[PDB]
Symmetry: C2
Subunit: 163 residues, 2 copies
């Protein structure tokens, strides 16, 4: 359960909008204090992505990934945006680049097909059905085993076509 | 003289909760809304510069709670009745998406100063003092102008401060 990919950031809960509206470039300390980050975890499909702060992720593997995300997608971004000789072109190109990128991650929590189905034996007396899910636009290497009853909540037609 | 819910502007997935929780193909009920989301609050007697994302948990015992309940009903629960419906058409979805987008674009204006109207220097309890600008916000507009800390308003709008000061 480490950081695989950082996908996005947004203003931190319980913090005034004003804080991320300043016309100066944030520091890395600004990044940790002002934002939450949408984390894709190493052990898990995009279905299990979560927004965290630096404080809530705690002592985690893959931290340099969070730092690098901050450097590129907040700090350098804001160097370009807040530059005195920034152009209207630059802004539109950066906006469309970001949108295109976020649009692609949106694919990855959608099942394309369900590939296989095993039932798991739990430590208790009990058992739970699992589906091997191929995700949209991710390859077969990234198909993951998921709880069957989550997949039915998420993708009832794809489970029907299963059956 | 208080801090309650004035307007609920938007909702988003709660921090530390898996995305799957808001990706299910069933209509949320009000308990779902309380557990799965955060909500962007405009507070009574604060400008939109002071809006914050809160959960039902973090807002606690707060005035104007009915406004959060009505936000949930209209914009999450209703919205999902229509989207996850039967009977839904491609046109319905595009219309709803556009309506939301237009609503949220308008709110964006409200934390952007149009003009600084006046300055006063506030006398603080500790014997010190802080300057205060009266800001007219874009698209608001005059009864909603607010006194703001002068230095916030330079971090936010340095040009509309050079032009106030020329």
């Amino acid at each position: 359960h480490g950081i695989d990919i950082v996908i996005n950031h947004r203003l931190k809960t319980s913090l005034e909008e004003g804080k991320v509206l300043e016309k100066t470039v944030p520091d890395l300390n600004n990044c940790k204090e002002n934002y939450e980050f949408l984390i894709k975890w190493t052990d898990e499909s995009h279905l299990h992505n979560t927004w965290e702060t630096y404080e809530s992720i705690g002592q985690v593997r893959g931290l340099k990934r969070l730092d690098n995300y901050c450097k590129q997608f907040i700090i350098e971004d804001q160097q370009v945006r807040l530059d005195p000789y920034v152009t209207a072109e630059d802004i539109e190109i950066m906006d469309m680049e970001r949108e295109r990128r976020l649009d692609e991650f949106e694919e990855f929590h959608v099942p394309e097909r369900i590939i296989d189905s095993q039932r798991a034996s739990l430590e208790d007396g009990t058992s739970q059905l699992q589906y091997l899910v191929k995700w949209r636009r991710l390859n077969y290497d990234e198909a993951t085993w998921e709880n069957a009853t989550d997949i039915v909540k998420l993708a009832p037609e794809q489970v029907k076509h299963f059956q």
